[PDB]
């Protein structure tokens, strides 16, 4: 297995997948690595299994249909995976914890949002449809863009949002256009 965390690329107390060579810190994996006995498969493998069992799930979908899906176990899993893919990017650090807003000539957003809050909302099964999860994720980057305006720091929001949207389109097999 790998000797660094798949998500944050650091060594430490790592948990190894049994069906692939990836390794994870306990709380870098989403969901947090399960304490159940042998064996254990990481979310990459579990997502791969889903895709393989239903090859046609890779055909193109409309975003509108995807967003209205109820958060049944497989949809819950896909959102956990999509969230993890965002954490995999180092620039996710800027969006992980609770933000604060005190900048000359800017007012903070009406509804602050950050990745650890979305992670907790997923863990506590607070989203009933995919739409709720996607809206909170997109809110993170929209808040950032509105607040920093013309400061070049706005680009971080654009970069991490691009990561989110590419993985959304891939994981949920959105029709190519
Ligand atoms: N291109 C690599 C690849 N994508 C998939 C996939 C299967 C079902 C739904 C979404 C994606 N499987 O392999
Ligand atoms: Zn890690
Ligand atoms: Zn694995």
Author numbering: 701 to 877
Give the article text.
PHD-BRDs have been shown to act together in substrate recognition. The PHD-BRD structures investigated in this study fell into two categories, those where the PHD and BRD form a compact globular structure, and those where the PHD and BRD are separated by a rigid linker ([Fig fig7]). Amongst the group of structures with a globular arrangement of the PHD and BRD is SP100C. Analysis of this structure by SiteMap reveals the presence of a novel potential ligand binding site at the interface of the PHD and BRD domains ([Fig fig7]). This site has a SiteScore of 0.81, which would place it in the range of challenging but ligandable binding sites.
In the case of the PHD-BRD tandem domain of SP100C, we have identified a novel binding site using SiteMap, and identified two fragments that bind at this position by performing a X-ray fragment screening campaign at the Diamond synchrotron light source. This crystallographic evidence validates the predictions made by SiteMap in the case of SP100C. Although the binding affinity of these compounds was not determined, they were clearly present in the crystal structure and surprisingly no fragments were found bound at the single-domain BRD or PHD pockets. Oxadiazole **1** binds deeper into the pocket than aniline **2**. It exploits hydrophobic interactions with surrounding residues. Oxadiazole **1** is positioned to form a hydrogen bond with the backbone carbonyl of residue I871 via its primary amine ([Fig fig8]). It also induces a conformational change in residue Q751 not observed for aniline **2**. The primary amide of Q751 is rotated through 120° relative to the uncomplexed structure. A comparison of the binding mode of the two identified fragments shows that oxadiazole **1** binds deeply into the pocket predicted by SiteMap, with aniline **2** occupying a hydrophobic site at the mouth of the pocket. This arrangement of these hits suggests that a fragment linking strategy could lead to optimized ligands ([Fig fig8]).
